Symmetry: D2
């Protein structure tokens, strides 16, 4: 049998977009209220409250009404001005990409760059900051998803705080799937969204903003105002007694409401545990069948996405095509400099359950073997299962 | 009995957001696919096709992934260069607001402004274009919603074309509820969205872009690129074989797919007819019970929103609070200048049915009489019913 | 304009089926579990618990997996045996209809019958019971919906209890919309369902069963066992530790779960109040415009359905057709001996909000006037509104 | 990690109920219309048309408003008169169960019974019909689900027709998952429903009725009438111009509408192929890891359910509890005789995809090894994958 390209797949195991929780999809279907209906004004305020609780924030997170690339661009546009010297940390596609937005808003850019299967070394950060007292803003990506790797942002954030600089963190693909919060890494801007680990569709940004960041953005004549790119316009919009700068994405807010309830009710620690276990089982299976995890070391591999290095000679695009056509299972490609180099299996929200690692391993292995590899698929499944069975 | 503010209302008869069609709400709940899943790539292309058909467009409309203020801002940012001379037409809050975006991108701004219950006179536009042949861009709002009035954009577009200038049209609250299309008004950028008459929630922009406008923007090095404000980056994103600049709002796309089906299946002409009839019945009822339509003349009153002038001594906010608390019916406030001056009843998508004019008139009359007015509510209902029955 | 018969209507104001609450419709869409999945076993038990609480029952209500005609037939088949002498009380279609099932299961049938706009007189019941000590079973319909009238079942039930007979009550169209419970009327079998006032679709039966009824049915060799008509098979099915006689309607159970939550959370008294107010406003409007309520007296008119007598000479079928075609509003016909004699407007669940009485009055009046009547529609609306505004 | 019993599972791989298609679940959420609304009357007629097309029927199938045990009971009650001589065929729990209903309606019962992992031999049927020419009705189950085995109903039907007798077929767990239709087996009453392979919840029956069967039932004064058990009362209910005997399950009808669309649109042959392939892969995996398929021969194993024999000393209930608690995967128990003797993995509708056989095999193996077995799980996965790849 073959799955037609025009027909829906059986299991989507991608790293974004991802399958949304069924409850979230039903939440999207709630009656759409007028945004100034008192019932919606209250709901919106309470959604911000839920986000604050989930993010362990001392102040209100800002919800912006576009998917998190908006948050990233708006952060650069608002916080970075030409007086700033920015240190951008790049260990992958998103990290490198952020530097382009930094350069748009200040001509002064320093970077620490590592190959796209590595993590930023905190020692290198400490040394760079010491050598460059002029640095005023530092940007970092927590989980640089197209590589399936994690940066040590809490240690980095403490170094940056000691230096006296502002920290911008991209935690879009880590928040809700592992332990991370704005406070944990002394973030001044912490950008995330519900469209990865939290199991909602793309459309909203959740942004932690420090008091110091608020003061810097509000002072900056170049910060966007009366714009889609404005953070400052949205400062007070959480309040049931305040207007919205422009019309909020009402149905997405209904989805976010549900997604936050699911996360908070399950227990964040429990949610992080099943992401990590699914990922751990995946990696064990990958290695046992004869493939290589992309990450330079297991220690930096993400608990919310496994990137699998394409064996030299295998056509990675054809591989993903074969996994869907043969088994109905959909994986993510790489992106930018990781495109063609690896395949990504998301372990996010509803797919952060260890049984999905078993499904992913079988489709990935079967597709590899169809491309002429000689993987020990059974051995792979048994190693993944041993991880599941060993979990304490 | 009273409806508490925290509980859901019974009927929402606002002018944006509005309740979505039930089918659209179920559509939002479709399984969320990876955006590069071939089934989604096909779906997205097909949605652009449906939009092109609905908009009667000779080329592909662009879908942008934010609610329509994104399209308005992006149009200003891309089409208006610093050497352009912009004529902004202002008959209300949106029209006036656009001029501020124009001034952001060119220092050369001319404006025709009329009172906020009046319409722009095409003759005044012709007179201005004659006086200022250096004009290269003209911007206009079709339905300036906070006023419930309509501008003659086809007549205006003809004059703009006669003067060789570009035309930017805000048709966000008119498209789908009355006869209007990019090529009716010879628009170069025509901005709308499904969040008013089409009965979908806020989140997406549908933009008609003329081939002339494409050439102008692509040749403009200042047009946003690598930005949420970019139109040009989305030029080829309609195609199943092409990437998305950033992750599309998958669930909103699902809703839009359904909204377009509903519109195309019912028959656009039939859809426009019920909007106009609902509005006509509303206006007849308003006048008959002793109230006044805001619009300076009946001829310029919108078929998609009725604005009702607040009588002297009536607290408009308390009025809307009372309509909801007493009858569970929700109306829109004014905005800016019109805030506190009028009440708006939307006739949009699912609420563009004449029976809703009856419900609106009763709640509006009831709340007005609670505020000490002595309206002839029965007389209002009969006049509205007479309009319905005369079209029968 | 005209609403096509093939297209959906605008407002459904019928007396069964009725529009379901939006939340219920979303609840129907929950993932369908295996019925012996422990999570479903627990849900089912908790749904019975919720039904018990809603019904103020001292013991467990039985849920049967068909719409309430199943409950009625199963009650006759199980409780009535040929030794019984049944007194059937008939003031309408359902009441008379029940007698046919009684006669199927015992040849001994006495009846008290009144014309189909009247209520059973408790004095007549007391007298009949005194004259006939042989009576062992009495059947009564609480709200005989095709007439929009109410019987005094609590007084009747006390008379029946004093006599020593069993009481079977049909409360399908009253429970959840006015004060009534199995205990209130000393019911031995109390049949209801969520498909009227509770705002769920047709498919389930909720049945109160007295301990005495259990003993009588379980003793009866003729009571259905291993049958769709079996009550006795389902005695223990509420328990998470017990099997289901046959597969329960899983999605309907999910709907019922939501419907019970909505009722219990709103507060039953508050729910009954808005049914009665909607009905009271309806009746006031009907009389004020020049029509007649069907009920012999206002005191016996149902708070969950208004039946409006068809003026002599008007074609009632054509009238309902015209209300939908002209206004998009759907009313119920009569049934059996009330077909052609009256039109029914349901005030049930989501339509038990007074604003819907306003909509119903206008469509009903408009349709009547289109058929050549000369109703004072404005006066009708004003009288309905006066009721709403007077409510303390 | 462990999945608590009270929380939802991850994958339900049971043999009824089963998870519904997501589109069906959204379909259940359609607005509930009055059953005599012309749009519903049309919809209902169209659903019967779709069912007729799917069942390849020369006449209209009857939809009954209870889950398929209603159809089985009603078939016995209407088609079997006290003078009929019934031959019941029993290869499992459903088959044996039917004989009890036959005996309810005629005292003349003959039976062929085989062990509950075997199939009925058409030659044994021929031998019996020769020995007993007085036979007038024969009943058979196609897929006796608690055994996961299939009877050769087409061969049997041919012999029943050769002897001039009526044939009643239970195809509830086979129709839509393999090639089978009323006219394939020359059925007089063919009972199925959408709650197994068609991927809709329990609540409706789809019954094929031969013209000969119509004549027999209509001439039978004992056939249920004015009863939930009545087939004859529903004879003309398909028509938009005709009443319903009692209120149809409107939301279940909406679900069935979608289920039929999905089946017809995918292509019945393609649907059957994926059921069979999933089952084939499952059986290969079961055998390869060291377990045994229940069926006496592979040839009689169902393409819609795999039954796996419980090894000696393994507690089957604890086994299923462990599969769910460890891996979040839910299997069916046996039933009656087979309870405690086997475990069932459904391959039905949405779960008839081969990747689910992989998930099932892993959870089943994992739970068996937890119970102290020493299965070669990797070997099982590879054998299942080999089956998939060989069909590729």
């Amino acid at each position: 049998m073959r799955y037609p390209e025009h027909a829906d797949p059986v299991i989507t195991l991608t790293a974004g977009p991802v399958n949304a929780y069924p409850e979230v999809l039903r939440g999207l279907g709630r009656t759409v209220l007028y945004d100034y209906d008192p019932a919606f004004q209250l709901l919106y305020e309470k959604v911000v409250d839920k986000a604050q609780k989930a993010m362990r924030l001392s102040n209100k997170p800002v919800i912006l009404h576009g998917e998190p690339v908006l948050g990233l661009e708006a952060a650069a546009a608002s916080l970075i001005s030409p007086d700033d010297v920015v240190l951008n940390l790049a260990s992958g596609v998103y990290g490198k990409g952020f530097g382009y937005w930094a350069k748009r808003y200040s001509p002064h850019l320093l970077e620490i760059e590592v190959p796209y299967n590595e993590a930023i070394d905190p020692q290198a950060v400490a040394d760079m900051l010491k050598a460059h007292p002029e640095i005023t803003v530092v940007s970092v990506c927590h989980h640089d998803t197209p590589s399936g790797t994690i940066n040590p942002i809490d240690a980095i954030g403490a170094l940056v705080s000691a230096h006296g600089a502002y920290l911008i963190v991209d935690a879009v693909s880590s928040f809700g799937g592992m332990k991370t919060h704005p406070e944990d890494c002394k973030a001044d801007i912490y950008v995330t969204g519900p469209n990865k680990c939290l199991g909602a569709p793309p459309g909203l940004t959740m942004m932690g903003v420090s008091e110091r960041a608020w003061a810097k953005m509000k002072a900056n004549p170049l910060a966007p105002r009366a714009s889609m790119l404005s953070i400052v316009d949205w400062e007070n919009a959480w309040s049931r007694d305040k207007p919205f700068p422009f019309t909020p994405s009402v149905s997405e807010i209904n989805g976010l409401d549900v997604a936050l309830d699911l996360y908070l009710n399950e227990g964040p620690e429990a949610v992080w545990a099943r992401h990590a276990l699914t990922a751990k089982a995946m990696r064990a299976g990958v290695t046992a069948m004869g493939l290589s995890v992309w990450a330079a070391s297991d220690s930096i591999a993400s608990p919310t996405t496994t990137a699998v290095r394409t064996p030299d000679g295998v056509d990675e695009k054809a591989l993903r095509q074969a996994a869907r056509a043969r088994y109905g299972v959909v994986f993510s490609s790489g992106r930018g400099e990781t495109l063609g180099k690896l395949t990504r299996i998301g372990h996010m929200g509803p797919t952060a359950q260890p049984i999905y690692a078993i499904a992913a391993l079988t489709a990935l292995g079967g597709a590899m073997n169809a491309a002429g590899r000689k993987l020990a698929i059974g051995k792979g499944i048994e190693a993944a299962l041993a991880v599941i069975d060993a979990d304490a």
